[PDB]
Design an enzyme around this catalytic site. Structure first.
Site, PDB file in Angstrom:
ATOM      1  N   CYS B  78       2.992   6.501   2.629  1.00 33.02           N
ATOM      2  CA  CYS B  78       1.841   5.972   1.879  1.00 33.02           C
ATOM      3  C   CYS B  78       0.502   6.082   2.610  1.00 33.02           C
ATOM      4  O   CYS B  78      -0.336   5.186   2.508  1.00 33.02           O
ATOM      5  CB  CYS B  78       2.098   4.524   1.459  1.00 33.02           C
ATOM      6  N   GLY B  79       0.288   7.187   3.325  1.00 32.75           N
ATOM      7  CA  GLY B  79      -0.941   7.370   4.091  1.00 32.75           C
ATOM      8  C   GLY B  79      -1.316   6.160   4.930  1.00 32.75           C
ATOM      9  O   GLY B  79      -0.587   5.745   5.837  1.00 32.75           O
TER      10      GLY B  79
END
Lengths: 247, 104, 245
Positions: B78-79
């Protein structure tokens, strides 16, 4: 080693009976050759062994052959020097050894005993017309699932277990189930395990792997396949663990 | 392992770029609807200059109980995305616990 | 080494003084042994050194012992060659020394002087009886934080800093604060670059590390702790950094 070979060769040349010689640490038969060859005047070879490593190793290994009077089956416990699987002492014995079985410290540090590698351990008796067609197919599928797991070890370790597919996740969980199911309680390793040993035949492990990798029982917890004799004992351990979880 | 990881993360970069572009294409698919909706709404606001007794969806007459609805990204790694989102969500629910809003 | 060591031991054994001998580059002694024994006909040994690389330097080190009359605190700047600690010429010195501090080139490539690597740097005096449970416990806690940072450096590899959860993020912030704080403008490094030197005491640095590990200093940025003395001066440097923006 030559003394053991002489006893076995007598029992195969004269007594006409198939004998089963276990040599432990055949690598000593090469290392002692090294320690004497150093002083003897023979020049040093590669990493430190004797020059005639291969011819001496062959002089031991070739005398072990089924020779129409009997059959000397033999299981040499070759020692890989610090798991240098490319070292001369195992590299020369891989050529002589038919059904080699590479045991790995990597699959022992996580406690999966025996530490036999599912991939590296290979035999020239895994040809289908020799071993049975369904057995060969199950062996191929198990080795392929373990190879897929070893190739996904890099993605799992770094990018998280979730970042791969949801069919490949089924293959990962199936590979975990398989590589834990191929653990065995030995009768002589009860002092290390603490649990009694279960001797399990060939057809029973085939019937276990069929149901494991056929996706029919991908619900059991991973520990329910650990150190278990048969798939029925694994099913029973799943019940034991589900009761111990809430109790 | 590092080379295979490099290949895999390059593949994920390419796939994520294609997914960003396809989400942009879905937004451009939606932009006819949004434009027609934002012009018909003004047409209504011009025919009637907010002369209304209606629309229970316009009860702003108090701030009694807010429903902060937080959408987040739903995958792995998720970055640096999900943590920032739920961090701002936690700050906002703290500020709504100050006022005594009973936020859902 | 032998002649300077005799010069020191005469003072430690006849005049009863607490003399120091800052023997510099022990490795140069061992490498001189390597040259002479490559030319003395003595048979070669591990990678290049003399066969007597553990008895000649034994004659160096074992003569440096604190006798019941006087004590000598030698500081031997032994040099690892090619920057690997597995080498035999410093490996035989590790067994003789007791407060070895490995100046790894990593922290100097990062600009953190001194580059004393906190994980490799170790001493037999980090014991409860010697330093007290206070200083020992803080040393254990700081080595814990730095070890956790070094072991998750494999994740601060290929991925980014963000992928850590809040636990690893906090321990990384604290570890960066620490590994920055472990720098100090020397009183003799006024020549190269930086501030005049600051003498930092044990009971003074214990306060700084207690303060950093206690979590009460999360507000300070990283370049505030770098190249500073005491913790009060670190907070002063942070305040002045904020004023200069």
């Amino acid at each position: 080693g030559l003394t053991a070979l002489t006893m076995a060769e007598y029992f195969r040349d004269v007594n006409e009976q198939d004998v089963l010689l276990f040599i432990d640490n055949i690598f000593r038969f090469v290392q002692a050759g090294s320690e004497v060859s150093a002083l003897l005047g023979r020049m040093p070879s590669a990493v430190g062994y004797q020059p005639t490593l291969s011819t001496e190793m062959g002089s031991l290994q070739e005398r072990i052959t089924s020779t129409k009077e009997g059959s000397i089956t033999s299981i040499q416990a070759v020692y890989v020097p610090a798991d240098d699987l490319t070292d001369p002492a195992p590299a020369t014995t891989f050529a002589h050894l038919d059904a080699t079985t590479v045991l790995s410290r990597g699959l022992a540090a996580k406690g999966i005993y025996p530490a036999v590698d599912p991939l590296d351990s290979t035999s020239t008796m895994l040809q289908p017309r020799i071993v049975g067609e369904e057995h060969y197919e199950i062996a191929q599928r198990v080795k392929e699932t373990l190879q897929r797991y070893k190739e996904l070890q890099d993605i799992i370790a770094i990018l998280g277990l979730d970042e791969l597919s949801e069919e490949d996740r089924l293959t990962v969980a199936r590979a975990r189930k398989i590589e834990r199911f191929l653990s065995q309680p030995f009768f002589v390793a009860e002092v290390f395990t603490g649990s009694p040993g279960k001797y399990v035949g060939l057809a029973e492990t085939i019937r276990g792997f069929q149901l494991i990798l056929s996706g029919e029982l991908d619900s059991l917890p991973e520990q329910a396949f650990y150190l278990v004799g048969n798939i029925d004992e694994a099913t029973a351990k799943a019940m034991n663990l589900e009761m111990e979880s809430k109790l | 392992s590092v080379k295979n990881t490099q290949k895999i993360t390059e593949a994920m970069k390419l796939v994520a770029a294609a997914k960003v572009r396809r989400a942009q294409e879905a937004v451009v698919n939606g932009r006819p609807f949004s434009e027609t909706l934002v012009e018909v709404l003004y047409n209504m606001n011009e025919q009637l200059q907010t002369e209304d007794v209606d629309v229970p969806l316009t009860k702003i007459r108090t701030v009694k109980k807010v429903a902060l609805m937080v959408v987040t990204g739903d995958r792995g790694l998720c970055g640096g995305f999900n943590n920032m989102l739920l961090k701002k969500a936690e700050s906002r629910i703290a500020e709504l616990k100050k006022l005594g809003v009973d936020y859902t």
